Amino acid sequence: GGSCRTEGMSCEENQQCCWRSCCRGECEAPCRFGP
């Protein structure tokens, strides 16, 4: 519900994140922790 999450805001996936990109806790681009 409501407005999308911006970069670095907390989430569960692309579908709430306005970046349409990977999120395992915050709105991100690389779909993996560390290198």
Q: How was this structure determined?
A: NMR
- Tell me the C-alpha distance between 10 and 30, whole Å: 15
| Alpha-helical runs (H) found in the chain | none
CA 32: distance to chain centroid? 12
CA distance 35 to 5: 24
28: tokens are 């991100």
Q: What's the domain range around 15?
A: 1-35
Number of domains in the chain: 1
SS3 28: coil
